[PDB]
Amino acid sequence: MISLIAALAVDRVIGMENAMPWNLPADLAWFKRNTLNKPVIMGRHTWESIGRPLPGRKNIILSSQPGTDDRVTWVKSVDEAIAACGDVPEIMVIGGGRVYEQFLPKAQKLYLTHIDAEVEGDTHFPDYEPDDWESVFSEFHDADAQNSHSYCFEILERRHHHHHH
Ligand SMILES: Nc1nc(=O)c2c([nH]1)NCC(CNc1ccc(C(=O)N[C@@H](CCC(=O)O)C(=O)O)cc1)=N2
Ligand SMILES: [Cl-]
Ligand SMILES: [Mg+2]
Ligand SMILES: [Mg+2]
Ligand SMILES: [Mg+2]
Ligand SMILES: [Mg+2]
Ligand SMILES: [Mg+2]
Ligand SMILES: [Mg+2]
Ligand SMILES: [Mg+2]
Ligand SMILES: [Mg+2]
């Protein structure tokens, strides 16, 4: 199964870099917990932003612009990315915007962090039809001394499909 995992500010703005508009170590812990021991697929922009393989995960980089780094697995299409993961229970797609857009139709689960921040960026999470999904988990957290903004974790499972997403 393929899942997407993303942190969304207002207007579905995402940030892949370390310098995110927000500082949410709680969200990074959520990300790590839900991706550990699973393959992660990302585009090259996200790869360069992370800047080292995510430990404890197979790192697959989708790009028609492959780099040379031998520490990760480079693939040239969505289908090839999926094949490179093989027979695992769950493949995690970790962005960025265009990669999420291409993988959404193949995904059956979303792990979202809805962050109460309005921000400057222009990269967005894809459009999805909310009536196509069931919200099977949600948990709101207030900001605290370690986490700059309030946020709500959510897990959605797909119930319906309308082809483009
Ligand atoms: N929920 C969520 N939050 C994010 O911040 C996020 C996301 N999903 N999906 C893709 C994405 C792309 N950017 C990044 C940037 C850095 C790391 C990273 O360094 N992760 C470490 C955690 C570091 C820590 O323990 O504080 C890891 O091992 O996962 C991951 C993804 N970021
Ligand atoms: Cl990317
Ligand atoms: Mg090589
Ligand atoms: Mg299987
Ligand atoms: Mg800008
Ligand atoms: Mg825009
Ligand atoms: Mg899009
Ligand atoms: Mg779309
Ligand atoms: Mg409070
Ligand atoms: Mg229904």
Residue 10 to residues 61, 89, 152, 162: CA-CA distances in angstroms?
27, 31, 12, 24
Q: Which residue has the tokens 């028609």?
A: 64
Structural domain boundaries of the chain?
1-165
Structure tokens at 147: 């986490």
Please give the annotated binding residues, written as ranges: 5, 7, 13-19, 27, 45-46, 52, 57, 63-64, 76, 95-102, 113
100 Cβ below 6 A of ligand 1:
no
Residue 98 to residues 42, 46, 47, 136: CA-CA distances in angstroms?
10, 11, 13, 26
Residue 55 to residues 43, 58, 119, 163: CA-CA distances in angstroms?
17, 8, 29, 34
Please give the annotated binding residues for substrate, written as ranges: 5, 27, 52, 57, 113
Experimental method: X-ray
Q: What is the CATH number of domain 1-165?
A: 3.40.430.10
Cis peptide before 43 (omega within 30 of 0): no
Structural resolution in Å:
1.1
Residue 89 burial class via C-beta count within 10 angstroms: exposed 0-12, middle 13-18, buried 19 and up: exposed
Bridge partners of residue 74, in order along the sequence: 61
